[PDB]
Design a protein around this ligand. Structure first.
Ligand code: A1BKM
Ligand code: CL
Length: 167
């Protein structure tokens, strides 16, 4: 039993809800919140901009030190950093950004990072300003993640479309 509430069960291990991941994280304080990161950990907009703003820019300060030490992530890769006031940990995961021309096949590699964590609160990777089809992202999630994933979908219209079309 965990503290996640109001989710629709899609499969044995994948759940979905119309929710703002920022507000959901603040309420649940999950062990792991997933950020929709870029390789530079520049948290300017989309989910990343919202998560960072909620940390009062502490996420960005920590991230800049991480990049100064380690260099950029790989597309499809991840790193574990602090969850600040939102979660114990933040798993920064880089899905391909279609608006940059990145290979959509890397979306599966991106979701594989979730399997290193028993339970996660997450957005759909590569959705939103990353330009991928969210229906495809949900399919890859379900077919790749084996650990327990709680998906927060901000847009109510998109959430209903994702549910109604789920096979
Ligand atoms: C937004 C659209 Br159109 C479709 C993608 C989507 O639902 N992305 C998200 N999913 C969950 N929490 C979220 N918080 C914020 C700020 C975003 C962007 C977000
Ligand atoms: Cl985004």
């Amino acid at each position: 039993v965990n503290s996640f509430s109001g989710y629709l069960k899609l499969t044995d291990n994948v759940y979905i809800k119309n929710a703002d991941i920022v507000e959901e994280a603040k309420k649940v304080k999950p062990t792991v919140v997933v950020n929709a990161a870029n390789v530079y950990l520049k948290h300017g907009g989309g989910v990343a901009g919202a998560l960072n703003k909620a940390t009062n820019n502490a996420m960005q300060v920590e991230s800049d030190d991480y990049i100064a030490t380690n260099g950029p992530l790989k597309v499809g890769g991840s790193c574990v950093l602090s969850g600040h006031n939102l979660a114990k940990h933040c798993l920064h995961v880089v899905g391909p950004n279609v608006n940059k021309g990145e290979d959509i096949q890397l979306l599966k590699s991106a979701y594989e990072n979730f399997n290193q964590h028993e339970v996660l609160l997450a957005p759909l990777l590569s959705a939103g300003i990353f330009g991928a089809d969210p229906i495809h992202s949900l399919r890859v999630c379900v077919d790749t993640v084996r650990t327990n994933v709680y998906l927060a979908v901000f847009d109510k219209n998109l959430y209903d479309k994702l549910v109604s079309s789920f096979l």
